[model samples]
Target: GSPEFHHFTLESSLDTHLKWLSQEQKDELLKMKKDGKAKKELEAKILHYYDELEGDAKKEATEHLKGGCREILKHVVGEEKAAELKNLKDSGASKEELKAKVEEALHAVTDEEKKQYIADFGPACKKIYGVHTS
Candidate 1:
């Protein structure tokens, strides 16, 4: 479930980030296309590059996505809880436990978590999002 969520959420953020990228980075993508790099290859190349950058740059790269709305993106959910949600416990999860991760990463949500976050916060959930949910 989380893999699906992660894949789509990355697609969502990439749509935003590509729009926000420097023209130079856009051109690099185009050049890679002209040079015969497949789209997946291009993403893999970038992901690989990010893997090489740690500490500050790594943090910056992550923040490029995380800093937007919910403003926190851990590989897993949060360890803390808000006063309203303190009663919820880990009931475990499907596959990678996306619910736990969602609960952690969202203080307020970006568009990313709004669509499915209900399974975490239920019917009373407010619009915690700062981006488009659909």
Candidate 2:
């Protein structure tokens, strides 16, 4: 027997990350990752360059990282949860509001859905831009 969600893909990764980002931020980060010297360099030297970056340069790079991570998180968590997370970010909504919203949304997903979402998320994220996935 096979599972409904024991799978992942690059398209899924891209869609997940790009989903809730403000349009401009998404485009900017995509261009950074699309294909280029820096993109290649960034991938090849992820550890070396990141730790070595300077004040201003590191600041800018981290902002880009921030954008990239959010997109990846969307894929990891699933759509509704991701959107609500984005909504929470944009809302400047309080912790109480976030808790209430998250709780309500989590209740909206069936237990089976939780199992499937978790199954697909982790391995997919590990491969994001590192390589391909199913």
Candidate with best TM-score: 2
What is the TM-score of each predicted model, taking all chains together?
Answer: 0.33, 0.36
Candidate 2 contains a number of clashing pairs equal to 1
Per-residue lDDT of model 1, residues 105-134, tens digit only? 453544555434434323222222212132
Model 2 residue 46 CA deviation (Å) reads 1.7
Q: Report each candidate's C-alpha RMSD, comma-separated, in the order given.
A: 12.5, 11.3
Question: Candidate 1 — which pairs collide?
Answer: 76-101, 77-100, 77-101, 78-104
**Residue 128, candidate 1: alpha-carbon lDDT:** 23
Q: Summarize candidate 2's per-residue lDDT along 18-107 as a digit string, tens digits.
A: 243345644554455454434333344433444466786555554544456445445545676868766885788665565456445545
Query: Could you tell me the lDDT of residue 41 within candidate 2?
Result: 39
lDDT of 1 at 54: 67
